[PDB]
Design a protein that fits this description.
There is one protein chain. The protein is built from one helix and seven strands, in the order βαββββββ. It is mainly beta and about 110 residues long. The protein has one domain: Replicase polyprotein 1a (SH3 type barrels), CATH 2.30.30.1000. Strands 1, 2, 3, 4, 5, 6 and 7 form a seven-stranded mixed β-sheet that branches. A hairpin with an 8-residue loop joins strand 3 and strand 4. The longest helix has 14 residues. It is found in: Host cytoplasm. This is Host translation inhibitor nsp1. The PDB classes it as viral protein.
Length: about 110
C-alpha cells in the first residue's frame, strides 16, 4: 500500500529519551520510516523552544493534502542546518523514536510510504 494508517503517540519534548534518528539526512529519513513501520515512532508538536531541545537532522511530518477516516495525509521532510530535503505542507510535528514515554495525545495520520 502507498499509504498506511498510523496513530502516533504525541510526546512532551522534555520526556523524550532519544532526541533524533541519526547523523545524516538519509539516515534519519530511513530510521523514521523503519520506526513508523515498527510502531516505535513518536511525534513532538513544534512550538517556540522545542527544536533546540532535539537533535539535527530533524524529521518532520508535513500535511501532503487537504483527511480520510480522520487521518491527515502526511509525508516526511528532513532538515539539517536550515536546509530541507523534501517539499510539503504545514508541519504536524517532529518525529522521534518512542521508547515507552507516556503520550499526552495521539495524532491519526495517513503516511505516504
Amino acid at each position: 500500500k502507498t499509504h498506511v494508517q498510523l496513530s502516533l503517540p504525541v510526546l512532551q519534548v522534555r520526556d523524550v529519551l532519544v532526541r533524533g534518528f541519526g547523523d545524516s539526512v538519509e539516515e534519519v529519513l530511513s530510521e523514521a520510516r523503519q520506526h513508523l513501520k515498527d510502531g516505535t515512532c513518536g511525534l513532538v508538536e513544534v512550538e517556540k523552544g522545542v527544536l533546540p531541545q532535539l537533535e539535527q537532522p530533524y524529521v518532520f511530518i508535513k500535511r501532503s493534502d487537504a483527511a480520510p477516516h480522520g487521518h491527515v495525509m502526511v509525508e516526511l521532510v528532513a532538515e539539517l542546518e536550515g536546509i530541507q530535503y523534501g517539499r510539503s505542507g504545514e508541519t504536524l510535528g517532529v518525529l522521534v523514536p518512542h521508547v515507552g514515554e507516556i503520550p499526552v495525545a495521539y495524532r491519526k495520520v495517513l503516511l505516504r510510504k
